[PDB]
Amino acid sequence: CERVVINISGLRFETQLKTLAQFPNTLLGNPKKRMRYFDPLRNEYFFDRNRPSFDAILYYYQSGGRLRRPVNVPLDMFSEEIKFYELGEEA
Amino acid sequence: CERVVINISGLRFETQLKTLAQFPNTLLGNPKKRMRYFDPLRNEYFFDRNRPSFDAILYYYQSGGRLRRPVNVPLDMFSEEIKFYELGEEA
Amino acid sequence: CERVVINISGLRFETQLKTLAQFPNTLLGNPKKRMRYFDPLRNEYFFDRNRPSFDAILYYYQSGGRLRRPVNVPLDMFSEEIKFYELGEEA
Amino acid sequence: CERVVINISGLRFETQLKTLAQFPNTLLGNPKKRMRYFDPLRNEYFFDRNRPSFDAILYYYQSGGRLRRPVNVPLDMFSEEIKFYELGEEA
Amino acid sequence: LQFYRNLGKSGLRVSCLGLGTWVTFGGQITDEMAEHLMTLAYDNGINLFDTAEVYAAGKAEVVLGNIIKKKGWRRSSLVITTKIFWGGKAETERGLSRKHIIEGLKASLERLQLEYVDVVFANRPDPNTPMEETVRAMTHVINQGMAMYWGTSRWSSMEIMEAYSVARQFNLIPPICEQAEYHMFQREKVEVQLPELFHKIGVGAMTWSPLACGIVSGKYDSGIPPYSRASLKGYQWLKDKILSEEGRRQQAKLKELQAIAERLGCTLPQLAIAWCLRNEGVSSVLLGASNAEQLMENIGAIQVLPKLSSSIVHEIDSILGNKPYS
Amino acid sequence: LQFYRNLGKSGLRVSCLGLGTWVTFGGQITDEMAEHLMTLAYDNGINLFDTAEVYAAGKAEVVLGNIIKKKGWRRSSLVITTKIFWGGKAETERGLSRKHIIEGLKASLERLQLEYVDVVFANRPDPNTPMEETVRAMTHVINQGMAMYWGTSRWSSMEIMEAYSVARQFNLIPPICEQAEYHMFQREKVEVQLPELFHKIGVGAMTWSPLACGIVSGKYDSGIPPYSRASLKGYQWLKDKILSEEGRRQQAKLKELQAIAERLGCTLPQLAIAWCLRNEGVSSVLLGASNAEQLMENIGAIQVLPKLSSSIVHEIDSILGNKPYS
Amino acid sequence: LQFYRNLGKSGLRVSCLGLGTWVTFGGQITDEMAEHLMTLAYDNGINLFDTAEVYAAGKAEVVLGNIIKKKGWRRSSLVITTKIFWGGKAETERGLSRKHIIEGLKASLERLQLEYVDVVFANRPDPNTPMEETVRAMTHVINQGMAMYWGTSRWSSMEIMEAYSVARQFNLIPPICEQAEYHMFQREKVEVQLPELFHKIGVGAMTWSPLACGIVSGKYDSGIPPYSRASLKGYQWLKDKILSEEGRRQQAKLKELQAIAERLGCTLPQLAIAWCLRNEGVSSVLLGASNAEQLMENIGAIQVLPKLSSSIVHEIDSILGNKPYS
Amino acid sequence: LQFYRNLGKSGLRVSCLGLGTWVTFGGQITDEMAEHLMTLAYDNGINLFDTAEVYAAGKAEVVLGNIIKKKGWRRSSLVITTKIFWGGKAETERGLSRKHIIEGLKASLERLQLEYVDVVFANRPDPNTPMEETVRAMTHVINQGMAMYWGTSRWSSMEIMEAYSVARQFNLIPPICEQAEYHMFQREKVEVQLPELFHKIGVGAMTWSPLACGIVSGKYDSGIPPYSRASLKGYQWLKDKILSEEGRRQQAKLKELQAIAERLGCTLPQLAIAWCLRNEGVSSVLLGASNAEQLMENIGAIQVLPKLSSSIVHEIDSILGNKPYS
Numbered sequence A, B, C, D: 001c002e003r004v005v006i007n008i009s010g011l012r013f014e015t016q017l018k019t020l021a022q023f024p025n026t027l028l029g030n031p032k033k034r035m036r037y038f039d040p041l042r043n044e045y046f047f048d049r050n051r052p053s054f055d056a057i058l059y060y061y062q063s064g065g066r067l068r069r070p071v072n073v074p075l076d077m078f079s080e081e082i083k084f085y086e087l088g089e090e091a
Numbered sequence E, F, G, H: 001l002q003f004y005r006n007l008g009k010s011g012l013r014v015s016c017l018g019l020g021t022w023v024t025f026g027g028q029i030t031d032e033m034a035e036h037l038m039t040l041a042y043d044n045g046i047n048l049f050d051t052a053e054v055y056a057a058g059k060a061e062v063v064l065g066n067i068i069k070k071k072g073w074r075r076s077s078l079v080i081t082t083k084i085f086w087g088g089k090a091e092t093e094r095g096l097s098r099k100h101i102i103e104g105l106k107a108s109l110e111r112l113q114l115e116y117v118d119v120v121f122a123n124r125p126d127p128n129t130p131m132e133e134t135v136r137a138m139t140h141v142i143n144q145g146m147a148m149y150w151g152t153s154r155w156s157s158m159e160i161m162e163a164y165s166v167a168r169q170f171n172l173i174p175p176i177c178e179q180a181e182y183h184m185f186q187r188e189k190v191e192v193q194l195p196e197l198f199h200k201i202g203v204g205a206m207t208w209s210p211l212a213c214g215i216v217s218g219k220y221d222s223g224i225p226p227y228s229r230a231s232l233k234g235y236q237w238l239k240d241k242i243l244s245e246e247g248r249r250q251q252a253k254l255k256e257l258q259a260i261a262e263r264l265g266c267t268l269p270q271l272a273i274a275w276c277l278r279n280e281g282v283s284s285v286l287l288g289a290s291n292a293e294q295l296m297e298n299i300g301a302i303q304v305l306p307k308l309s310s311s312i313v314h315e316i317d318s319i320l321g322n323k324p325y326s
């Protein structure tokens, strides 16, 4: 399946487009919301954001909705990322 | 010795084929089981999986069988990876 | 906006130039101070320094001034990096 | 100054040759000891070893001799790496 | 409003209208008519001319090349495009393999008496050739100076993105344009899918069959006119479409559009073509003509453009009833 | 079932049967016979022709080139392949160094009177040249338009994967085919090793000596026939293999196969060749012939294919007793 | 002090003074004068000659090429540079698209009767072409041997860094030089911005209009002299600048500079040119001349250089009152 | 023991002895002698011939090219090498800039009447040109088919590694050989530094002046012989070295070596040359000769090789007293 590359302040993450599509209304899952961050030169989306937090952000999609705060990430910092990426908890 | 590259959601790991062959029945050690994940375009195997866990997965092969759960990886998440990669403990 | 790549002992970080310009007198924010570390061959600035600490250094700029010591970085090591990169706390 | 790239199971570290030369008798500091691990195709030295431990190994050279065990690395695993890279403590 | 514009985000500047050679050149019309048509187009500012290895089994290319050399126009003032896919009966004379892209283009350039084309297009997708191979071949002919740019035709958005992805992957050359069918009865791809690729990866849209082979001209109202494209031999497929149940429903709608045309003081063909250029998403529209009367009328479409108010456009969507959902 | 197929996963389409030039062209047969054989092959749909710089010290290439130019066939309808390794007595006229790949191919193209071959193969591995050098050289001649693709011959799976790995490493061009020996008495490599490389890196299998130099034709039942390949000068090695203890055991098994052939209403050679194409793993089989009678009989093998039921195949494995373990 | 120096950090060695062809070659002066001027320059050590496709609509290039071929100078002893951007009236005959860079340079080389230029420059920025396209095109013509290096002209520091960034991004070829205007009344870019790019990415500075088209020569003190550049047809823009309020204030300051010139025993033009070379930041200064008297006087500027003490320089800044802030 | 060997780890196979053209070709000896010398070398298995743009101001290359074409030897049986750096009096006719590497090699190929050389060397380091530029230029001429490989000469280990590093950095072509001086009185670089580069990055060692310009032949025992290299005009530097205090101490040691030579039944020159090939680290040794007597004697050195026992070698180090420390 088609893959997508997400560059977080230099740290590259790669996942299948269908993995993100599993949550169509989140920022990364909505084509219109993530469009603004696409880099045509490298074929990847770029976010000048916190690196440690993204592992949990990607795990959210890969796990089907589990939102776990990484041990090394402060509570206030993680909440800001959840808000930016527009992640929901309610199942 | 011939080397193999394993791409875990964008995080690349490299090891010698003989390191993986040390456990022929695990997913990464069996040519037939890992074949499905090979990417001919980049000459690497790709897994759209949890990144933090793979260090322990690779260490399993490099250490000859030691299975240590990384401090930053939850117990339930690590068990799922052990199952997927088909790792055994019994010596 | 124009981006800048910072290579810390092999670990690459990328951020927008305007993110660094937010603190003109720090080492990375002053064109004259960081000039010495530019690598024309790869179009990046190179620092033969501690890797774990840089996440906090970059977060300082991205957060608008928050200086948080990473849990895995000793107190004395972090203070040396703050000094080298010339980061201030006083708001 | 001339730089050297060290590939630890896929994780690349870069440092100045003079940084390693600061300890001529260690494995990485002795041209004859590290020669065996050189990869002419990529111009880097390759070690099919533990990744988490190398940060402390490199810090040893960059800090002038400080040997700190990373919080996330078990005591027995770290001692094996110190032995392999032939690092001394005695000042 | 802007006669010349960039083809997609590339640096290549084309006229909003172009002149194609399918059916006519080396086939339906005479070389004398061909020369006259191309001369009128050129003097009227059109710099874009399209053809393909398959048209009239290569003859279309020969005639185009003869006119260019006969007229002596500066090569740098012309934007010549050709398509590759069908180039012979042999098993290896079709497709997008490295072998045929190179042999196909080389043969077209020979027939065209040209050193290079400005844009070489894959005339359609090739299920038998790996994308990597096709992209490496297009990049090769460009690096050999046989073409300035390359594009796709009849490719899905997914296929175009893949070409782009493989190019970035191996640092080759991405495509800059998709040649797609666009007219009042074929709207989805150009209006909903292509714009996304434009903004995302800069691929432009060059459209064809603005009159749906002439159907939108309104001349098939009472039936198949003598000497019309639908009357030509080899085009029974077009005759069947026009006379079919669907074909008749289209003609019925054209009668309503004809009323809008008369209201605006233009002809149906001019309305249809101006309609195609109403949105910036389209870089250029490839015209087709068998008479000089047709061509000049068609070019007159540019004047109709300013009349296409938002009310007029909505009026046309109401009668067509096929406005695509984005 | 499908006469033409892709060579491995590449876009190059070849006929399931090809015609080689070893021993015959410029050697055993006359240019008149050569022309006749190639003409029959071509008219029967075969587009694949194989040769090598070493065959008849270059003469095989000269004769092939003369026929092509004499017949005037469209270059785009032909898939010409040649192999490089042995090209002279000088120290630098052999191997896979950049110097010899370039000089060797250039010389072959000159003898062939061609601008390029469709596939250039390394005739065997070169222990004296770094893989990187060889891969950069094959990629170079392809980029110079001297060849469309490149492949390997007599290389181990490990060596092929290495070529592929180095190519991806330096973004060069991976090989698309391995030319391997395949017949009823040489099965392991083609049946067990090559399939894995096909699915993994897309490398196709083009096989040679379908009749094991004629041995599988059954004509050496009573001994070495006059004017047979084994009777030719320079081929005492083949005569020794046939008369040896192993050679006799092979002939004994052929007598059993002959019974299966008569049962199916075909000849032994046709059975042997159809047998080679029974599995999709093989893209094409390179034939060899010194008579037009042989060639047409051999091509008749295609008709035998549908008769090779699973029972017939198992029956053949039982008599051969050499089914490889995967 | 060092007559020859590297152009930026590249390996190309140029004379500190060069001779341009704007206005004069194929325009204001005769081919006889042109030959004489170039001969004097060459015999005096100048190896740098600049021109452009737009100068005298291509004629400047024709005359330069004729002189070189007539004199028979070794190509390897000459550093020829040309600029591309304006090459015709057609929509596609201007800009930095791949199409025009290739067609433009090819046409210039044809007029110059040369196989390649040492440096091809983009005469100005192109808002209509993606940087990537422009960088891939400059790299292409270099790889095709049509040029040894490429540079920019009238580009902002940001634009130059972008060209450099894209080059490193796709492993293409970065620009090695920016041709910028530099004289006593236009100082900011060369003195404040370019040095940073030199130290950072090695881009050199080649400057033009050292005399501000002759204004700094002092001959417009009392008005527009007969046969002066400002008197030529097509240059009313220059005449207006000189007679304008700003123009008069400049002339007033030149009267003060004239006193410094007499004090040093040189002429105003020699002072102005030596002044331009006072800082190492400038690799070379492109001269302009319509008489042999002018040229030899201008070259005499090199002798004036050692007199430009720190006190003299500060004195000149005091009268100019335009020293840029870094 | 192995007459032919790989040059470093490359695939290029050279004879352990080569024939150079410095001083002699187009200078000291006649074209007739040159032809005779090259013919003897070739018939004796030598395939390596070295020259340079600077030798006899290009004449050495002209004579070499004439002999090759006159003799009609197959190009593929020859390994021709030339060096670039000094190619004229103009500022831009020297160095390792892209401009001179391309112009220099092109001019040498023209004089040599050859399409390409097997190895092009930078005759010495260029402090005025960025390594990247030099590596991109060597890679360019190789990709243009003007050379098969490139190497360095008189470069430090650090400089060679840098060339290699830049090549891997930008995926260009690393150098495969360093041409270094090696003889009994100049040993450090070849014995201590080059081996490390061989094992690490595969760079081979091709050595020159095996007889230290003839000094090691022993003919300067009593003084400067008539018609000797030291007697030639332009070589006062060599005459001064031989007669100097250091020169005399060398001659004294040669008298001791002469005794070892007589003991082994060979001449001093043969001992000196065999000594140079005693270690595998050296791929080939470039000979120099002005007589056919000299050449055949020198080639006879190969027979002396098996006599260089470990005791003999240690004996030679004892008299030389210059064994390098690794």
Ligand SMILES: NC(=O)C1=CN([C@@H]2O[C@H](COP(=O)(O)OP(=O)(O)OC[C@H]3O[C@@H](n4cnc5c(N)ncnc54)[C@H](OP(=O)(O)O)[C@@H]3O)[C@@H](O)[C@H]2O)C=CC1
Binding pocket: E019, E020, E021, E022, E023, E024, E028, E050, E051, E083, E123, E153, E154, E179, E180, E207, E208, E209, E210, E211, E212, E213, E214, E215, E217, E219, E227, E228, E229, E230, E269, E286, E287, E288, E289, E290, E291, E293, E294, E295, E297, E298
């Ligand atoms: N990339 C691809 O796959 C394809 C690209 N194309 C391109 O675009 C062009 C195809 O458009 P085409 O399909 O030719 O045509 P259009 O849809 O524009 O129809 C033009 C035809 O309509 C008739 N016509 C034109 N103007 C008038 C008028 N003013 N009044 C009455 N009848 C008129 C003529 O028919 P008659 O001859 O009967 O008088 C003429 O040939 C080709 O030239 C080609 O370059 C075409 C097909 C596929």
Ligand SMILES: NC(=O)C1=CN([C@@H]2O[C@H](COP(=O)(O)OP(=O)(O)OC[C@H]3O[C@@H](n4cnc5c(N)ncnc54)[C@H](OP(=O)(O)O)[C@@H]3O)[C@@H](O)[C@H]2O)C=CC1
Binding pocket: F019, F020, F021, F022, F023, F024, F028, F050, F051, F083, F123, F153, F154, F179, F180, F207, F208, F209, F210, F211, F212, F213, F214, F215, F217, F219, F227, F228, F229, F230, F269, F286, F287, F288, F289, F290, F291, F293, F294, F295, F297, F298
């Ligand atoms: N890449 C590599 O290393 C190699 C590739 N090859 C390729 O494949 C081909 C080699 O196959 P080859 O080895 O020629 O042959 P085959 O194994 O197919 O045997 C063909 C030979 O068998 C005889 N023969 C053929 N058909 C019949 C028949 N119907 N009845 C009786 N005898 C018959 C002929 O012998 P006679 O002449 O005695 O009549 C003929 O020359 C070459 O042309 C070459 O292109 C070959 C060797 C190595």
Ligand SMILES: NC(=O)C1=CN([C@@H]2O[C@H](COP(=O)(O)OP(=O)(O)OC[C@H]3O[C@@H](n4cnc5c(N)ncnc54)[C@H](OP(=O)(O)O)[C@@H]3O)[C@@H](O)[C@H]2O)C=CC1
Binding pocket: G019, G020, G021, G022, G023, G024, G028, G050, G051, G083, G123, G153, G154, G179, G180, G207, G208, G209, G210, G211, G212, G213, G214, G215, G217, G219, G227, G228, G229, G230, G269, G286, G287, G288, G289, G290, G291, G293, G294, G295, G297, G298
């Ligand atoms: N890259 C770019 O965008 C541009 C680059 N340039 C380059 O640089 C050059 C432009 O400099 P140019 O602009 O020609 O000139 P300068 O500013 O150096 O002025 C030279 C002019 O001044 C007059 N002059 C010269 N020497 C003397 C003297 N000693 N005494 C009195 N008058 C004198 C002449 O005028 P008259 O003819 O009236 O006697 C002559 O044409 C061109 O040749 C071109 O190569 C120019 C423009 C743009």
Ligand SMILES: NC(=O)C1=CN([C@@H]2O[C@H](COP(=O)(O)OP(=O)(O)OC[C@H]3O[C@@H](n4cnc5c(N)ncnc54)[C@H](OP(=O)(O)O)[C@@H]3O)[C@@H](O)[C@H]2O)C=CC1
Binding pocket: H019, H020, H021, H022, H023, H024, H028, H050, H051, H083, H123, H153, H154, H179, H180, H207, H208, H209, H210, H211, H212, H213, H214, H215, H217, H219, H227, H228, H229, H230, H269, H286, H287, H288, H289, H290, H291, H293, H294, H295, H297, H298
């Ligand atoms: N890459 C670089 O920088 C350089 C490379 N080289 C290469 O290597 C070669 C240089 O070696 P060269 O320097 O020529 O020479 P050698 O050190 O091998 O000395 C050869 C000279 O010694 C004399 N001689 C040779 N054989 C005998 C003998 N058997 N008995 C007595 N005298 C003898 C001759 O002198 P006479 O003429 O006096 O009889 C002859 O010209 C060149 O041809 C060149 O290709 C050379 C210099 C620099």
